[PDB]
């Protein structure tokens, strides 16, 4: 029954962070009554995202996701039974990560690819959610 | 000989406080002879139990407790031998887990579940093991 | 929701050949239904039986069985989730254990346990099984 | 890169043994090029299908097979990196899966889930895989 | 010349006495250094649980010298083999009485480790044997 | 109770005859199948070596007997513990001599899990005198591990 | 010192089977005295070899594999000690696998990857090996 | 993609410190915009280095590396696939380590190998891996 | 008394010719049964390769004693342990001569543990060794 | 080619301090160039030494040892690559262990043996080898034949 999913998309090219929040805010919405949690990242033109629930649940939010005009390519990374959450305080977070970002920051994503700014495509399952373990605990 | 028996059960709809009180006293009156400890959650209308004691006085106690008119439709989780007791502190103990729960509670309902209610059928063997010990740490 | 529960009991002195017939006849007719499958063993006046199947109908028929008239003194050995059957070929077998069993009956017997009489009491969950396999592929 | 994915479905109601037919006819003329292989087991009312390819394709076909109008509430069981495919010979292959299927198939069913009838909602993701893995030996 | 480890029960006669139990206490303090044995004694009337370590000549010839004592019988030797190090290396023996008079803090040790209370090694296999003898040295 | 295994090895007296050695088997024999022990008895001249299984109280009902027996001394538990499931299906009616005058194919068998090709059980350990035992008890038919 | 080096590189655009053979011809003449055994396969347009020997050996060899001027962009896929060989027969053997391969050869790059094209560049190590050792086993020689 | 690939050299007779520090200086230049971290192990006259990386990265950096006329006879000791870097903080950082080395370095080149002057060429994996992890530490 | 297992390897001096191998086989074989000693030893010219298993008091007292043979030098012990049980149990010595004229199947072994087609037991580690020893004995 | 050897073997009767001395001031002479490191104990008559270093070096130093006239009966323990040194801050650390050694040193004794006076040849090679690590952490100086502990 408790599952979690790791996917990653191409948000459209012209993403404002104003649509950031407008995704934060209906995930932040939506969540809690389906009982998913999990944690976003955007960094440009990329996301990547965990998420945590029930499998019914957990598919329903993602196959609804992919709906969404303000991304395309979804590549789930990973999809399987979980003994326990990683994310079960937040219905969602979102994080922006990019070229801009701090050096602790550029740091993580090093450690888990060969360059500092996140490309999912260039990631393992492990790595993915290595990488989201480790972000969770910078702010 | 040393055992450790996990199920599930459905309340009948009328359970109000003193019949927890009821069972309670009663297993805190019949276990210490038995050599049983434990601990018994109320998740309106479910009861998760865990048992421990010597695989004789174990099926002595469950299969009394199953002719209890006070819930029906038992469901074993698990039962197996055991290393070394991890309830030893209380002959027994009853925690209700519900919607009135705290915040801490809730949140580790939904650490080992799909939803923040704590719902047995839910869970595999792993789950409610984990759920019951954190639990029985917070009390 | 796969699962396996192997008990042992004490048979009522009384018991004939026809009764071990009338209990094979009744599982044969509900465990179909059911989706039960399993193996029992009649050593005077000492049952084994292991159950296979979804957990809600192991448990529906497990505590069906306890209410029988012809045993009494149930013992829960094991009660787990497993990954497969190995007991699926038959909705319910019945073979008596005795001295007047095959030589290759009463070894297997003595493989698993202190006598050449079968005494569940006296065997762990893992040598329940190997016998209750050993046994079932020589029938 | 090389992946493997699995899910459920529900069928639409009124599905006729000549959709199952059409269903087939566009995978085998569709996965060669993408370097899909598989197999899919429709059980009534429900699909079940394993997919292996490289992770970008094998999420293009998956994508495209749920926007599709002969099932809905697709469920993915599992969605992994794969050391090497296990269905490499057939693009796509179709067995249909019922009460009238043959005793042998009924008991492969049985060996991996709580009955005779599959239901890939009752199953985990190992039986799953070893279930479709047994049957595409038999066939 | 293989370091060994001996691990055993058995039930003392009706009516041991506080001073037998001091009385072998004191033999064993006496006859253990010379042999090299170390190990622990519990008493639980009306049974023993007791462990020895030392060379295989020496626990073993220690043993049998102990089972022949009129004070206890029906020893069952629960384990015995070859031992990787001691873990009760710094008593020659030491001897600690378990009952329902021992404090809240032991019972529940007891209790950890078996299906009652009270200590009966018969029912205890020889890893919950060892690790309660760990346990209950560490408190003492 | 549970299942176990015991192996030990002991001094015969000096001056043990066959007569002797027969009465102990006729004894073991005797008592052993009733309960429940199967396993072996090895004699390699003045020692003895052997594997008992069975429920632990008749283990080591059966071993505390031997030891009080005045045709041997200095008795070694070798090793002593719960089993998942016997290795001898049998309480072997025979007595196996292990000495000089054994074939080539038993001296090997010593040489493979000792320094000699006389039997010495306190130079080997657990293991080693389980595979010989089990070994000897296949070569002479006795046997099978099931 | 027994090691194992697996790598992939891009053959020259105007590669030829008889430079295919020179190859062959190079390695056959080379490998047996400096103990190197493994095997090539040509996949157009990128080569896939397997190198066993002593370290040095293999280190040598593969240098001087690179500086040839018929391939480039040489990327080792996993360079490490190995316990045993695996292609001790071959001192070394050369496999083209194309479009014009045989079904079960096909069926076989497929087992390991995502097409029946064999791409080393999307192949794990793992999949590199296994794939050379069943490719080896189904053809015959030694 | 993410790799590691270590390798020995023997740096030419002549080398001088002013050497040392421009091949420190060249690293430090290219390696950032390579995304390439690691650390260089000078004993002279021999090199030991560790690179990270992506796969296409490592290798184009390693392959032009064995073009520089300053050392010869390169032995690749390890290259795989890793799960995470363990530099990362250094783009490339240098050091020296000969018989005027603290006791403390010397007592680590001891610890790892068969004298107190490192023989890179000497040492498998697991010890070059560790000795750069634990070297690193201490400066 | 222990059972233990020693493999070590030798240089030959540049003189040695058949009879001197003979001559070592002919006094292993002598020797090694009163000790209980076992083994197989292989000959590539220059070097040694030699297994030995028995009491470790007897392969100490062998090994020592080979050590002191003036037909070798710069002996380097290459493995030595407790063994569960022996593997050259059915021969008190062998010797096999492994050179660039024994069979493609003995070169072919050689190769398959080690960097060339001449045995040079420097290039191998214990298991390796072994594993050598153990093929080259069942193709024997 | 990093590598361990232990050894036991009898030391000669009349072996004194100074005997005791000139073994350790042998050692450390020779030992650092060969990139040899280790430990030696001394219950009498018995020694007790593991060495680490190269193959090679262990092996020349080790059968150098064994030509020693104050000691015969040499019984290797142990001899196998090793991963990483476990002795490597002496090139040679010598203790002398007996029934006038500290309770704390008879206690480690006892702990891997069946008594509390030294014997090798009743420890097999992991008794051997982690007796011999414990004795490393509690020694202080490259000997105790000056001061002890
Ligand atoms: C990258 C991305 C991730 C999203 N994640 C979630 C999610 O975690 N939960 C959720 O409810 N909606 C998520 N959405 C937003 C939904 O697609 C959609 O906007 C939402 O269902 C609309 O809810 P509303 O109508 O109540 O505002 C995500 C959208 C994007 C593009
Ligand atoms: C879900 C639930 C859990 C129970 N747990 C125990 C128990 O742990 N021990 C016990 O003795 N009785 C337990 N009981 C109560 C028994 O069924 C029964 O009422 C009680 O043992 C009667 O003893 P008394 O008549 O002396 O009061 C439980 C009952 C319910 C319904
Ligand atoms: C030891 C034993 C094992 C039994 N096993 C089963 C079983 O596997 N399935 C079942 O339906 N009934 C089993 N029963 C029989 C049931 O207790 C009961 O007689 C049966 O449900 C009556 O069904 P009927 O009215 O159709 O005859 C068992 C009874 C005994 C004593
Ligand atoms: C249960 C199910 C499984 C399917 N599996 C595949 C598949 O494996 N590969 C594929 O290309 N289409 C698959 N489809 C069919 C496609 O959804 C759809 O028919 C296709 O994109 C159009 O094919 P066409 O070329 O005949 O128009 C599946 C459909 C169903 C409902
Ligand atoms: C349960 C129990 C444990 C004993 N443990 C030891 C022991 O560890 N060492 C020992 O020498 N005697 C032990 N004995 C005592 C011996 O049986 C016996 O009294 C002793 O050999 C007599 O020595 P003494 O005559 O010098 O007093 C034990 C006795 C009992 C009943
Ligand atoms: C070395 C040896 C082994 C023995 N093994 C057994 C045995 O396995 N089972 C047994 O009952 N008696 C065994 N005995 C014989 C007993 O000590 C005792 O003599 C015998 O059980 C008496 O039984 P009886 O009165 O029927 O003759 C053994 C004796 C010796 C010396
Ligand atoms: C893809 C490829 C693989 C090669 N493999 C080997 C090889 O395994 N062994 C070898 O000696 N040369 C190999 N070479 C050839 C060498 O680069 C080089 O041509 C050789 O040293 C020439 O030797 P020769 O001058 O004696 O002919 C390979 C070349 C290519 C491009
Ligand atoms: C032992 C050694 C290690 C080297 N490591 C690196 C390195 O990590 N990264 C790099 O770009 N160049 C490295 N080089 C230097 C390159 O070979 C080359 O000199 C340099 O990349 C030229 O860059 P520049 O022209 O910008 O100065 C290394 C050279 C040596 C001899
Ligand atoms: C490489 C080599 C291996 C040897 N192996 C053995 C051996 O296994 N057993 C043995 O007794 N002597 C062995 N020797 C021979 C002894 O060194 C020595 O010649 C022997 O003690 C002479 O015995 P003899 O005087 O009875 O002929 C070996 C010698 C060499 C050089
Ligand atoms: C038990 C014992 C251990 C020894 N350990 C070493 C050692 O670790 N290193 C060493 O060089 N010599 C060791 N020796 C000393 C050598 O046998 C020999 O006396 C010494 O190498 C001669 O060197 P010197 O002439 O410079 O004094 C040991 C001797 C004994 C008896």
Redesign the interface.
């Known amino acids: ?2 599952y979690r ?1 790791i996917y990653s998309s191409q948000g459209i090219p012209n993403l404002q962070p104003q649509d950031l929040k407008d995704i934060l805010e209906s995930s932040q919405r939506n969540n809690p009554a389906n ?1 998913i ?1 999990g944690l976003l990242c955007y960094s440009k033109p990329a996301f990547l995202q965990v998420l945590e ?5 957990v ?1 329903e939010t ?2 609804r996701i ?1 709906q969404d005009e303000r991304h395309h ?9 979980i ?3 990683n994310f ?2 937040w219905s969602m977070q979102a994080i922006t990560v990019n070229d801009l970002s701090t050096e602790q920051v550029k ?1 993580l994503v ?7 700014t996140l490309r999912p495509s ?6 993915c959610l ?1 990488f989201l373990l480790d972000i969770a605990k910078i702010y």
Do not use: W
């Open positions: 029954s408790l999913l009982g949690t629930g029930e499998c019914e649940q598919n993602y196959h992919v390519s979804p590549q789930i990374i990973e999809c399987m039974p003994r326990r959450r079960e305080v740091t090093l450690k888990y690819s060969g360059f500092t260039a990631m393992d399952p492990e790595q290595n």
